[PDB]
């Protein structure tokens, strides 16, 4: 038996957690906080030549999603960086040098996707740390799989992370969930502990 | 008597529903998902010449809301397409051809509106399907009334929808809730079943 008052408090706490970027963890990869995509290696943007901007009927411009969007909070359907194939890369300079402890990856939920499936979602992926530049050899921090049957937002704690700190990390997508032309990345976050 | 654990679960489910575009239904009219406003017929935008952009005191540009905003998720006060009169039209090419089953219309809530009233909200409206182009004769899919005393977001299931599928639909606003100069449309969504 729970009182009305306890219900209120439980609701209050859940909404405060909801309002703290859903998961309550600072994101060192958030663009507005000072992070950016610095390279995509040889990732080939999947360009469809479909979203056409025009005025008085004059074709002006084809819009497509920048890699930058993976560090942007708006994750409505279609607001994702799409690359060709199931193999892609994004190198991110974090907003502060940290010891990384977890990353988060999300995708649009099935309920909002057509046919209720998300085969364009990343599946297996890995995270690498770069101690200085992005040309030296990456150190693997973790390998993980984004689960298409889990929550749209999934957090991934490194098992036995070292004490090394990094300001450059790379998200590598290895496979996807079956989509034959592309892979969509909605948002990638990186969490950890700053220099203390 | 409910346990703490059941409360948590109920809260969890309600927040997951909240996060799925509030109502948990894919929206085939969402612009970022591949839909667009293709015509407004003879709808006359209500232009006020009021929102003036300037630099070093130099008048540059009067901002006004595009029809496109009705397919955009941001619905803060004023982020609505306004037309003159209580009669207006918007033709939308959906992002996929579907059998339509429901539409949703929302407006700013009364609590956030001045005087706590929303007389600029649409009242009676109807939805038409176009089997191909937008010039042939529309087929009526439903007539409905947006209720000014209901929730800000209202979903409207068609009674006895046919099995016909469409990629072009038109929202027609017939009356409003009393506002003498214009009608504000915040967001219009269309739900249904894709080709299977």
């Amino acid at each position: 038996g729970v009182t009305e008052e306890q219900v209120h408090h439980i609701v209050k706490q859940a909404l405060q957690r909801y309002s703290e970027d859903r998961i309550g963890l600072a994101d060192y990869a958030l663009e507005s906080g000072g992070a950016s995509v610095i390279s995509t290696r040889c990732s080939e943007t999947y360009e469809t030549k479909t979203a056409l901007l025009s005025l008085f009927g004059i074709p002006l411009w084809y819009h497509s999603q920048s890699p930058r969007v993976i560090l942007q909070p708006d994750v409505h359907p279609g607001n994702c960086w799409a690359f060709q194939g199931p193999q892609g890369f994004a190198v991110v300079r974090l907003s502060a040098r940290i010891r990384p402890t977890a990353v988060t990856l999300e995708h649009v939920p099935k309920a909002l996707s057509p046919n209720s499936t998300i085969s364009s979602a990343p599946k297996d992926f890995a995270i690498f740390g770069f101690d200085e530049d992005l040309q030296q050899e990456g150190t693997l921090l973790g390998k993980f799989t984004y689960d298409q049957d889990g929550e749209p937002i999934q957090t991934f704690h490194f098992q036995a992370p070292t004490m090394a700190t990094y300001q450059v990390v790379e998200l590598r997508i290895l496979t996807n969930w079956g989509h034959p032309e592309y892979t969509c990345i909605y948002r990638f976050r990186v969490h950890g502990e700053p220099a203390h | 008597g409910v346990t703490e654990e059941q409360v948590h679960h109920i809260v969890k489910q309600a927040l997951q529903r909240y996060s799925e575009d509030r109502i948990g239904l894919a929206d085939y009219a969402l612009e970022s998902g591949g839909a667009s406003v293709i015509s407004t017929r003879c709808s006359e935008t209500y232009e006020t010449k009021t929102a003036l952009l300037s630099l070093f005191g130099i008048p540059l540009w009067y901002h006004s809301q595009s029809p496109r905003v009705i397919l955009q998720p941001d619905v803060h006060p004023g982020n609505c397409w306004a037309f003159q009169g209580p009669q207006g039209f918007a033709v939308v090419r959906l992002s996929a051809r579907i059998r339509p089953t429901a539409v949703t219309l929302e407006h700013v809530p009364k609590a956030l509106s001045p005087n706590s009233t929303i007389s600029s909200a649409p009242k009676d409206f109807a939805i038409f399907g176009f089997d191909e182009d937008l010039q042939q004769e529309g087929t009526l899919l439903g007539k409905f009334t947006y209720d000014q005393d209901g929730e800000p977001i209202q979903t409207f299931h068609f009674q006895a929808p046919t099995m016909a599928t469409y990629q072009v639909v038109e929202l027609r606003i017939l009356t409003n809730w009393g506002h003498p100069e214009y009608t504000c449309i915040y967001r219009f969504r269309v739900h249904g079943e894709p080709a299977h």
């Binding site: 056409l52 025009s54 009927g57 | 017929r41 039209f89």
Partner: peptide
Amino acid sequence: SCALSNNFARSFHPMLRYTNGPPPL
């Protein structure tokens, strides 16, 4: 006359159209 109109088409509001199928999502 009404049906033939498209004021959106004659404005300073850029129009968006999906000419070649859905965007990626």
